[PDB]
Nucleic acid binder design. Structure first.
Lengths: 211, 154, 121, 147
RNA sequence: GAUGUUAGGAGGGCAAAUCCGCCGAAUUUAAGCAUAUAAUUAAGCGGAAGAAAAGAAAAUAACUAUGAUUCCUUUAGUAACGGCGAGUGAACAAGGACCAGCUCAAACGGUUAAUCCUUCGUUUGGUGCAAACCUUUCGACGGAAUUGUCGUUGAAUUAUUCCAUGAAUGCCUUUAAUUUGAGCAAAGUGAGCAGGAAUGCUUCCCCAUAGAGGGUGAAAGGCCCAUAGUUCUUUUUAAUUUAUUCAUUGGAAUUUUUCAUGUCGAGUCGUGUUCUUUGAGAUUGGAGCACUAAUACGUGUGAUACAUUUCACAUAAAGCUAAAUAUAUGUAGGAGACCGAUAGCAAACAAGUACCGUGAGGGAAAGAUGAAAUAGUACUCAGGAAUGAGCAAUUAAAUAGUACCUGAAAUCGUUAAGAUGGAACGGAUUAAGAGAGAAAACAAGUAAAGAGGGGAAU
RNA sequence: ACGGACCAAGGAGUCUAGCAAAUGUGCAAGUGUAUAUGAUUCUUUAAACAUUUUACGCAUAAUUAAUGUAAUAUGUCUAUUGUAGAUUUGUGCCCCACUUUGCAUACAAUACCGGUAAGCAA
RNA sequence: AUUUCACUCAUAUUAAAUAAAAUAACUCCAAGUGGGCCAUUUUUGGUAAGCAGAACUGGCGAUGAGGGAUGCUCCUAACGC
RNA sequence: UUACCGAUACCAAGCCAUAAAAAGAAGAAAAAAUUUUUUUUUAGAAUCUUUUUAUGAGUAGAAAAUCGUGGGGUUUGUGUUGAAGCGAAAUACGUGAGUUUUCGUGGAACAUCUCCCUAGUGCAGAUCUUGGUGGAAGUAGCAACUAUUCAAAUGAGAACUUUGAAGACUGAAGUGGAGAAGGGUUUCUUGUCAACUGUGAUUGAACAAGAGUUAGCCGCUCCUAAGGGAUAGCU
RNA sequence: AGCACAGUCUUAACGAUGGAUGUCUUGGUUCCUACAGCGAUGAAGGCCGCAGCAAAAUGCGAUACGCAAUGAAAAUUGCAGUGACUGAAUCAUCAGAAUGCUGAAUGUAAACUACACCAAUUCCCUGGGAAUAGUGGUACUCCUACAGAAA
């Protein structure tokens, strides 16, 4: 090395020409999967190819405020919507047995979403114009004239898409309604100082509760 | 790019001290003209180029989207001044206004005879003449690489 | 052009033209027909055959006529009755005319042609 | 870009710009950072002083999401809200802006800068600096702790 | 148990680019070198598919929490490892592609193995000319299996809808898509010049939803194949002709009253030690040996060993699984700011051929007449013949005659000119000769005659 | 002292990764739209076009081994102080000396932030 | 000691002379170099050396031109046609 | 003591370039004919224009400005009335890489300097690689195996094909018959001489067309040895 | 009809040798796309053959440079001969038929065209005539049923 330069650390000391790859076929495969999903959606028969997903908070403390699509609703969410999972997988509803609803807000943010999805169901007959009431909480089925008049409108995909969340960053309050005496920094320091003994207290509380 | 094992696919024999020959590698064996000839190398016959072309060259470039829209706007503006388009190579001495606009019925009818007729009636007969007789076989090695003709833009 | 299934590559179709089998060479043998034949048969170009009669309108013999006598698709050439050329040794041979340089004026019928004309009709 | 290269302008100079006596040998001083502490020691001491050795404990696995904490100073607090909102806030003394910096993506508020004198501001921040608190309270605002 | 020239079946080998196991270096770097690095690579052994492998938490987090696997952007050259030297180096969260989840182990049917397989004959109807193929179930026999197959994922008890049918009756129409093979597909072979020969140059017409290419005696949108565009045919896949009854027969799924809180993978986990591997560090995984568990209130993680004890998550030691992903292989297509025969694959060709080595292996050189040889040199003379010459001969051309497009330089021949006493060439300056030269190197205009070319004027 | 008998053809600082400097360009406390997504774009098209109202990279804050802490300070929309200093204003639209402003920058002075000392320390 | 106000020390040849003194000062990036040798004067070791080792200055290297017949270093003098 | 000769140094002048400087964003001059014609010019490109002064070595090294090549967009051209290339040349241009023309050959493509993009882009050397060719040089040399001669035939052609005569050799451990490995048609007949047969050659183991190898008794095949492979296992 | 000394060197014109240059390109290279195995029903690979005149390459397998069938559709030609005047000449497709010896090679061997054992086998007409030393089967391991012997 020489002159004033950053000391090299280039991890290139093995046979790397074998590992080098270049993505010449990026837009080509983007097109191929575009036509793949278009063919799937055209062939399935008008049913949307997307599946409904829960709107759920992101983990950790970095992404506490953000929310995103999750892997399937919970059993209690489906029960509150009135659907057994084992029959709700049929209507494009994702379900997982691993998530647990840890808050009433999480429960109630997915229940009405499931109800909104259920409000748009249009069942189809199976036995050559022999429409039936349905099973397992799936909504009712429609007849010849009904299917002939609904099968040709604009499909709704916004509900399938991630729920846009509008949070009012710009908001304000009355000047006289402020708690002028609060000490946020002192509160933070006191909480950090007192963290150990509260853990002690919770430990002893639960030891008592074990009895 | 060139084939990866181009030129270097043989045996590396460089017995070249005391043999009164250059220390360049030689292919081994006998019974052929190839035996004893200069093997792979920068300067040898059939020895591979000194820096073989690789597919991971920086073929494309990343252009800022803002750069691109600035350039598009600038070219649109340049298309609206008579001197610039005249100097670029278009023969527009007969047309009236340089930001030329036609009614929406231009899209309606789909015969190229009437399209070129509309062009000449608007006053680009000499321009379409330039375009039609600019067609000719291009010079150089490219015309056997599926790149025969060379056409003036209109 | 717009059909990406088939190629427009110079070598790719030069190989096809020069190594085409006899069946495709027969279709390549097609030549324009005269105005009267065009009106009569509603077509524009037909392949030639041995007992056919043709007019050549290109080359050193661009005015002669005559029925063809023999064709061969290996050399992409046809031969008419009275275009004989003298050779060095001292015998008469036939000059080869490319079918693209000739136009037909008459056609014949047979147990095959009686159906080729019905096909073209 | 080859025609702009320096080697092209010295095509017939024999030495190719690499000296006649010194020549251009392959790795005449070692490969990479070979000569640290031995013969490139002068370069290391002159341009990368604290390179050798090690200091501090070991954080066995970091999990940077735990300590992620974007910061913002007090003088930028009036910058988040738009100009029209700021104008309609500064004129009326009966109304004060409430800013949730965690919405904008900031977690701690430091006190570098100067706040506009006699405009109360309520700030909802995950963490607060002592002097930031002091500036806000002096200007007449109040700090809100959120999580 | 052994045995079958018993009946019916499989495995072997080839092929590897991607993929899955095992085994496993050194060159190199550290400017030496031993740990380290190269590298969990090269070589070697074995094993599959169109993808493989991984895959349904004994997971992550510590948050307002997430929810199989895989891959992409990022985390991040970061945490960390390392003669802490050279160097090496993840994981979580986040944004996306894709997204399917499931079954074996115990309970019960014991007022009935309720299961599984083999063989032999019959029929329930069908698309194919045919061959064959899709469906069909009355069985009977022989077995396997209680050393455990199937039914059940709780069971009985109430409250709703499905799933099959046998038979008869009526019924195989019509739009879009997708896809293979087929056809049809505009306009000049108009003057004239020079041409061996236009596709060239002027000039007069056009067709274009076709001005992509290729061929044709030179550069063709209008000569040919075709290309645009359309018309049938082919596989399935969305919409779409037709249900009516008769019948009991069985089963399933959704929701009320009780039990029973059940089961939950053992030489396995784990620990000690050794080796290896890893970023994993009082050990990340694996393996060898020794010891060897608990039973869900458990044990397993929560990245520093330990004791006591909380919390969170998951429920190991059994198994299956399509997608997104990779493809220096083969095959078939399409392209390129790539190479243009010492280049490009070694091979544009009779190329892994000729040839070399006992062998493992090594491995070339070599394209071009002409538009047309359906124009490849006829005839004569001289020669034994090769050949040469012509008053002869094909071609536009033979100094294009098959070592044939062009035909450089090295080197050599002829002719001409010049120089020449142990170098030759040369620098600078002329002089003498020999070549070629008029674009400044004199003469614009002027009047006449001779041939033309234009512009304005009716 | 070494290579060169002659001629033809080929013949050697390049490509990628990463960093810095220099210069140009765009935007600017922001900047880059990453993977991906849609579109009657889809010989030419593997490129152009666009991103239903916080992904990430770098910068916007540093310092400490680290719990962590984190830049005048509310007397005020004057925004630290000097000595030089570019520009501006006048008085004696172009020469001169005085005041008027004080860019950049240099040399310093100050405060304030993180760490370490020293004093006190509920 | 610092700061602010006064007065004022040639500033119209310049707080001594001279000066193709701003061709200055500073910053960034980077090449080559890191075997030297010779001459005058001085000098160490050596009998001495065209020997070995040092100081100043100038040259050779890196540079030709006229001269010393001849000569990398001597004298004159350095170089566009 | 004078005079003279004598540098690429010195002095005067011209020109090139480098550096610096002064300055700059539209109107008629002359000549020749004879008031009227003709002749030339009549300018304004900021990395530009005019003018001025000083200066000019250079290895390693660094920069700028230029000159070329393959290919790509843009522009606009040359080609069968002959393009590229090639040989010779030019009252040609530049300072120079080079550029441009002439003649001949050539017989089908070529350039773009308008501007820019791109690179496998510039050779005198590397005991460089491949191919071709020289002086050496009609030279070294065609030297073991004692030795040939006369006449004839064939043939275009005979020291080295055949025949006859002679003189000789191998000479009892043979250039003699059969021998095996190895070779593979070299064997035979006929024909033939482009190359080979290091001289000639009509010869031939060369070239070309045909043909030729007959087993119950000769061998293999059978047996077993040194030993090899495999089975049972065992790693 | 005669004249040049010779040799060596230089220049020019025309040639010889040589195969550069330029222009060509049914080739290569790179990328993209799509499909993906073959084999005891005998694979890949290796031999041996096959045309009228036939060496190699290509193609084919005793039906041997090709048979049948389907689509196009009349030539193969070097001579010969062959063909319609469309299953006929030639292409293309290729599903039927056939596919020599080997080779995992698998009856025992192998520098053998050697040697076994069991059905002697096969064809003809739909109970009679022939060719024959001439056709199939027989590896090892394993799986599922079967058998007769055993402790």
């Amino acid at each position: 090395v020489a002159h004033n330069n950053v000391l090299p650390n280039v991890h290139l000391h093995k046979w790397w020409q074998r590992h080098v790859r270049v993505n010449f076929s990026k837009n080509i495969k983007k097109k191929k999967r575009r036509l793949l999903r278009e063919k799937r959606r055209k062939a399935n028969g008008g049913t949307p190819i997307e599946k409904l997903h829960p709107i759920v908070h992101c983990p950790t403390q970095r992404y506490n405020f953000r929310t995103r699509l999750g892997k399937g609703f919970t059993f209690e969410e489906l029960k509150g919507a009135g659907l057994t999972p084992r029959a709700a997988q049929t209507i494009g509803i994702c379900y997982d047995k691993r998530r647990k609803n840890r808050s009433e807000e999480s429960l109630t943010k997915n229940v009405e979403r499931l109800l909104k999805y259920k409000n748009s169901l249009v069942m189809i007959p199976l036995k050559k114009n022999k429409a039936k009431k349905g099973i397992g909480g799936i909504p009712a089925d429609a007849d010849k004239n009904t299917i002939k008049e609904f099968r040709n409108k604009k499909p709704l995909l916004s509900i399938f898409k991630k729920e846009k969340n509008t949070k009012p960053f710009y908001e304000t309050i009355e000047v006289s309604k402020i708690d002028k005496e609060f000490l946020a920094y002192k509160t933070l320091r006191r909480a950090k100082l007192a963290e150990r003994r509260k853990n002690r207290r919770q430990q002893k509380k639960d030891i008592k509760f074990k009895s | 790019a060139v084939k990866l094992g181009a030129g270097y696919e043989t045996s590396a024999e460089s017995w070249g001290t005391g043999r009164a020959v250059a220390r360049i590698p030689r292919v081994p064996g006998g019974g052929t003209h190839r035996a004893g000839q200069g093997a792979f190398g920068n300067m040898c016959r059939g020895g591979g180029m000194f820096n073989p072309t690789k597919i991971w060259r920086r073929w494309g470039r990343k252009v800022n989207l803002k750069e691109k829209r600035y350039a598009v706007c600038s070219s649109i503006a340049a298309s609206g001044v008579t001197s610039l388009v005249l100097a670029r190579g278009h023969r527009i001495s007969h047309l009236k206004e340089v930001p030329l606009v036609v009614s929406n019925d231009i899209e309606s009818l789909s015969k190229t005879k009437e399209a070129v007729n509309f062009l000449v009636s608007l006053g680009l007969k000499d321009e379409v003449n330039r375009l039609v007789k600019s067609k000719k076989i291009r010079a150089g090695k490219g015309k056997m690489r599926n790149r025969k003709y060379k056409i003036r833009n209109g | 052009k717009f059909n990406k299934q088939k190629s427009s590559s110079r070598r790719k179709m030069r190989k096809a033209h020069f190594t085409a089998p006899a069946g495709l060479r027969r279709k390549i043998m097609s030549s324009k027909l005269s105005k009267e034949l065009r009106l009569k048969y509603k077509t524009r170009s037909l392949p030639v055959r041995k007992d056919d009669e043709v007019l050549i309108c290109r080359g050193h013999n661009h005015g002669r006529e005559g029925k063809v006598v023999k064709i061969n698709r290996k050399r992409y050439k046809i031969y008419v009755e009275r275009v004989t050329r003298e050779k060095v040794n001292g015998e008469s041979t036939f000059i080869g005319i490319h079918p693209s340089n000739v136009v037909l004026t008459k056609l014949k019928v047979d147990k095959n042609r009686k159906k080729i004309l019905d096909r073209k009709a | 870009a080859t025609r702009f290269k320096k080697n092209r302008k010295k095509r017939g100079h024999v030495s190719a710009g690499h000296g006649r006596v010194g020549k251009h040998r392959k790795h005449p001083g070692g490969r990479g950072k070979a000569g640290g502490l031995h013969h490139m020691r002068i370069n290391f001491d002159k341009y990368h002083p604290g390179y050798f050795g090690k200091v501090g404990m070991r954080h066995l696995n970091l999990l940077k999401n735990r300590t992620y904490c974007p910061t913002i100073n007090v003088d930028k607090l009036w910058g988040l809200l738009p100009e029209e909102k700021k104008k309609e806030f500064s004129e009326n003394k009966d109304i004060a802006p409430v800013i949730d910096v965690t919405r904008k993506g900031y977690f701690k508020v430091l006190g570098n800068g100067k706040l506009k004198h006699n405009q109360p501001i309520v700030v909802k921040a995950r963490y607060f600096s002592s002097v930031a608190e002091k500036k806000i309270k002096a200007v007449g605002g109040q700090c809100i702790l959120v999580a």
